[PDB]
Amino acid sequence: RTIVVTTILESPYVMYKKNHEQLEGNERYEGYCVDLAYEIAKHVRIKYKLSIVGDGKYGARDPETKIWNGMVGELVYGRADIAVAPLTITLVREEVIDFSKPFMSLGISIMIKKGTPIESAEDLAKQTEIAYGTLASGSTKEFFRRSKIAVYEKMWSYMKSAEPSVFTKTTADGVARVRKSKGKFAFLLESTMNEYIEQRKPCDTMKVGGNLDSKGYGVATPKGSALGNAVNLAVLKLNEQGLLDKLKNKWWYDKGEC
Amino acid sequence: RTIVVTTILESPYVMYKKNHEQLEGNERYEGYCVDLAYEIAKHVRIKYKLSIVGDGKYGARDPETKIWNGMVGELVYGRADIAVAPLTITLVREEVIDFSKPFMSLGISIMIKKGTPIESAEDLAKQTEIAYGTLASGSTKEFFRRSKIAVYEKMWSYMKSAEPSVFTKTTADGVARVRKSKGKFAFLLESTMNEYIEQRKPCDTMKVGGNLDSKGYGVATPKGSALGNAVNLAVLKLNEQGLLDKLKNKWWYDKGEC
Ligand SMILES: N[C@@H](Cn1oc(=O)[nH]c1=O)C(=O)O
Ligand SMILES: N[C@@H](Cn1oc(=O)[nH]c1=O)C(=O)O
Ligand SMILES: [Zn+2]
Ligand SMILES: [Zn+2]
């Protein structure tokens, strides 16, 4: 009866409240996805418990052991009933879990330290003074790994072999590295996170260029789960009432610091 | 074995080729959705026949007779196996048919005759010299009808009662009316169609402001159809190969006239 909602600590989707160490259960967290889980549960009519994913990952399949990790894994092996998180809808994931229709649209983008002389992936690709990388595992990394498009192949060729590693274990790590690199590191990440970060102090980063692709985040459910249908209707409803747009303004722009 | 693909004459999704009167079957048409149906059928491995929807509509339910019209209707009453068209994913539709994940993202937008003094829905709403309207039936009209947001309620209040009607039976009609109105008519339509039109001669229209919402088009299938699953994977695949982006450039921007 109390359903497990797997999620992931990633601002501003899910965040520790300032006095969290003194709080319990759901009250520990706030963010866009905390609000969204609340709204969804209200329409689906369920009680639920947020659970930050143990391995801190999104979800990829180990090519060796065939095993799925991250939030995906939590749904594939039955430890969670639903994932409300910035989980990217992809072909490989969609073969093993279900996704609602997108609650947010987005694409991969480039984050630079202000002043950095880079406007496009082409600008990054044709040079080697400025390093660049992506979250160590996630759909962004995969986009590069799988692309057949020359510029992206070049970038992947460089990233996969660069030393030290240019991959990071979290978004926050990538951002820190951009901020600390005096313009000598650019980070490849989703436009959503990129835009959030751009609106926060010290206001020293910016998104440059267009997005590289066009995709979305879906609320995810175990394959053939009988919550799937309701959750999907619930998402469309919420989008149609303009609630999704309201929550986006609330967590990104309303409090923007820049 | 030969499956019926319902679609709709709407540039540049589906269009008569210049020598169509001399051609037969699928060869009569070209466009983004003609290309997309081709790609999908190739991955799903089916033979198919495009069929322009008889009533020229997208799909709404007659509140009186409960009957569904347009492409939706063609799927609900079994006359078509799939719809490959700029069909907007909505809550009411999703209750009666299935949609793949979005193949294109978009939102409602404002089309003006260049020079018209309007930058936002708020600008339209607060005045009455410039008339404005939407496709006579479609999700855009419905957005206005259902909104609880003050500005949109105002607009709907004005549109529903305006004389002569401000609704049009086709996109093309709305565009013509903007072009013929010397700036005294603005048209509410999806950003996709708006952008296409902006790139065509006489180059006298433009999109102004942000979109009013954020949604997408899905390939649609009869509810519980066993083509649904393949079509959905097929869409994600195509997006992941960058084919969807390539077709968008092909039909909108590559040949842009402005
Ligand atoms: N939403 C992404 C995770 N991730 O966040 C980014 O910004 N890049 C990236 O790969 C996923 O679902 O894998
Ligand atoms: N895609 C829309 C049809 N339509 O096209 C527009 O530009 N507005 C509008 O309502 C639908 O599926 O109802
Ligand atoms: Zn703490
Ligand atoms: Zn003709």
Curated annotation (Swiss-Prot), chains A, B:
Function per UniProt: Ionotropic glutamate receptor that functions as a ligand-gated cation channel, gated by L-glutamate and glutamatergic agonists such as alpha-amino-3-hydroxy-5-methyl-4-isoxazolepropionic acid (AMPA), quisqualic acid, and kainic acid. L-glutamate acts as an excitatory neurotransmitter at many synapses in the central nervous system and plays an important role in fast excitatory synaptic transmission by inducing long-term potentiation.
Disulfide cross-links: C203-C258
Subcellular compartments: Cell membrane; Postsynaptic cell membrane; Postsynaptic density membrane
Extracellular topological segments: 117-258
Gene: Gria3
Family in the record: Belongs to the glutamate-gated ion channel (TC 1.A.10.1) family. GRIA3 subfamily.
Source organism (scientific name): Rattus norvegicus (Rat)
Residues annotated for L-glutamate binding in this entry: P86, T88, R93, S139, T140, E190
UniProt protein name: Glutamate receptor 3
Other facts noted in the record for this chain: The postsynaptic actions of Glu are mediated by a variety of receptors that are named according to their selective agonists. This receptor binds AMPA (quisqualate) > glutamate > kainate.
Quaternary structure annotation from Swiss-Prot or TrEMBL: Homotetramer or heterotetramer of pore-forming glutamate receptor subunits. Tetramers may be formed by the dimerization of dimers. Interacts with PICK1, GRIP1 and GRIP2. Found in a complex with GRIA1, GRIA2, GRIA4, CNIH2, CNIH3, CACNG2, CACNG3, CACNG4, CACNG5, CACNG7 and CACNG8. Interacts with CACNG5. Found in a complex with GRIA1, GRIA2, GRIA4, DLG4, CACNG8 and CNIH2.
Lineage start: Eukaryota, Metazoa, Chordata, Craniata, Vertebrata
